[PDB]
Amino acid sequence: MKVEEILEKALELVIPDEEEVRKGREAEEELRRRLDELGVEYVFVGSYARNTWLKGSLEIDVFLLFPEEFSKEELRERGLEIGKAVLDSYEIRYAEHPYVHGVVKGVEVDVVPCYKLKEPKNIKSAVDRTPFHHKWLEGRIKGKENEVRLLKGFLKANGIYGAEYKVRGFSGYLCELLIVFYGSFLETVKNARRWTRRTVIDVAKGEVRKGEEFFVVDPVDEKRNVAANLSLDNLARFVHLCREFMEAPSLGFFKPKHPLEIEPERLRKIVEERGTAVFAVKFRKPDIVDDNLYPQLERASRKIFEFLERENFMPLRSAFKASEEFCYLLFECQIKEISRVFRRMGPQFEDERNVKKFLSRNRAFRPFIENGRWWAFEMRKFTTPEEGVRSYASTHWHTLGKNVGESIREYFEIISGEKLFKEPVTAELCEMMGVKD
RNA sequence: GGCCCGGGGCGGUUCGAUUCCGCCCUGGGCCACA
Numbered sequence: 001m002k003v004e005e006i007l008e009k010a011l012e013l014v015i016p017d018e019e020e021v022r023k024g025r026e027a028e029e030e031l032r033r034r035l036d037e038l039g040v041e042y043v044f045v046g047s048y049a050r051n052t053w054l055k056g057s058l059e060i061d062v063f064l065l066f067p068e069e070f071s072k073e074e075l076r077e078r079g080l081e082i083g084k085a086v087l088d089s090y091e092i093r094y095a096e097h098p099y100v101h102g103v104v105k106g107v108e109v110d111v112v113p114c115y116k117l118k119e120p121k122n123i124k125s126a127v128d129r130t131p132f133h134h135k136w137l138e139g140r141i142k143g144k145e146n147e148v149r150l151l152k153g154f155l156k157a158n159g160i161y162g163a164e165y166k167v168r169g170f171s172g173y174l175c176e177l178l179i180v181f182y183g184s185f186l187e188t189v190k191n192a193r194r195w196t197r198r199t200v201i202d203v204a205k206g207e208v209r210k211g212e213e214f215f216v217v218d219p220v221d222e223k224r225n226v227a228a229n230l231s232l233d234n235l236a237r238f239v240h241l242c243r244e245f246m247e248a249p250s251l252g253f254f255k256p257k258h259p260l261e262i263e264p265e266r267l268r269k270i271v272e273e274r275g276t277a278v279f280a281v282k283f284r285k286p287d288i289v290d291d292n293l294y295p296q297l298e299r300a301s302r303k304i305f306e307f308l309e310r311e312n313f314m315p316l317r318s319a320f321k322a323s324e325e326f327c328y329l330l331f332e333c334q335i336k337e338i339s340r341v342f343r344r345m346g347p348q349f350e351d352e353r354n355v356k357k358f359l360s361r362n363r364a365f366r367p368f369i370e371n372g373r374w375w376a377f378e379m380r381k382f383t384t385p386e387e388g389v390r391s392y393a394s395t396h397w398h399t400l401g402k403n404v405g406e407s408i409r410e411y412f413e414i415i416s417g418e419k420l421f422k423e424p425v426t427a428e429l430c431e432m433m434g435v436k437d
Numbered sequence: 438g439g440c441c442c443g444g445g446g447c448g449g450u451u452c453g454a455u456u457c458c459g460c461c462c463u464g465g466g467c468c469a470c471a
Contacts (some may be wrong), residue, residue, distance in 0.1 A: 059444085061471090062442090063471095087466095093470085093471070094470075094471080095471040096469095096471065097471070099471055100470085101471090110471070112471055116470095125461090125471090126469095126471075127471060130471080137445095163439095163468095163469070164469055164470070165439080165468090165469055165470090166469095170471095175465035176450095201467090225455095225467095225468095228467075228468060228469095229468055288438075289469055289470075290440075290469095290470095291469050292438040292439075292470095294439090294469095295438065295439035295440080295469085296438070296439070298439080299439070299440095307458090310457085310458090322448075323466095331451085335470065343455095344451085345452095346452060346453095347452050351452075351453090353452080353453095354452035355452075356452085356455060357452045357453080358452040358453090359452090360452090361452090374452085395459090396458080396459070397458090398459080398460080399458090399459065401438080401439080402438065402439090403438075413455085430452070
């Protein structure tokens, strides 16, 4: 029931069992033999190469080394031919540069081409940096592979493990650097409780200082922040999580939380209880990768939230959910309906010129003086948040993300009420409103 | 694709805009993917 106790039991959820290990070992062996039969210059990297991969995420990473002089095009072509002949099944994948994904004796494999170099300088792409990251780590993490797994298991269980945009959490690399710095999971967790948004962890110098942003300097390049994509809020969630764990250690921190569904009926009652306006913007999900899509959902979500605040609808929070089918931007506002009239500030009574221009506008109500300046009663084009957004989304589709915006232009509808509780967003809404139980 | 800094033209709104909402060109930095 104490820290050490829970951690022993926790290993059982993060460390791969022998069957997963053997399975990987057997594929690595066969993979070596196949690569050697073509006399290919390669180097295994990543969590598999260093036995730090989390249970259930066995994936082998093989980077193909290429002379500095080779053209970026030769790399991909020869890179493609090589993965082709060595994999049981292949599938060209992409990123900064293309590569090949596939299978071998049951396990996932990534065949990636990079430049064989020396000295981080002369680098050309993130992929070239990966081997250096690998070298720096193989000597220093040996022996603490399970501390890495506990850290990864902890983060994953709490939805902040990957560094991709859908997550904005802590990359695997980041986790290993943290273990090398603190020595173990518990030490990392114990100290993270004192982390601030100004913390700078410099691995190479074995130092922690106060900078301008959360910054974990890459031992391989002092200018690179390894936690660059860790969001401010995800950082906050981690620090808070560490405080709670240290105060009441539980194995629950390493178990994925149950989706805990809710009957749409109860959701309705809660929204009625809140007296708020709850609605969603629904449109078709553009066929793009999560890495281009989520940042677009975040922007679109924010531009609308911003429209809602300047338009005085008192938005509480925004959210969004993507599906195979559509995307949903979710909102909740304190104001279901606002009056048509509102007041417009005018010039000070002294400014005869501007006062005169200000009184030339034909208005339905007649302006007045108050505290030394003129004011005008004006009429709104819309009186509900839904109306406002239908208006905003129809004309400002372009500012809502390149793709999301293009899809919104060709189609979008606003759903509210019972018709909304039937969409696949009941979970995002419960989180947005802090529904508990 | 998104985010940060900077430039050159515009449209709309406002008594008044560099300064609100947005649109075209456009230079630099960065991030995710591998």
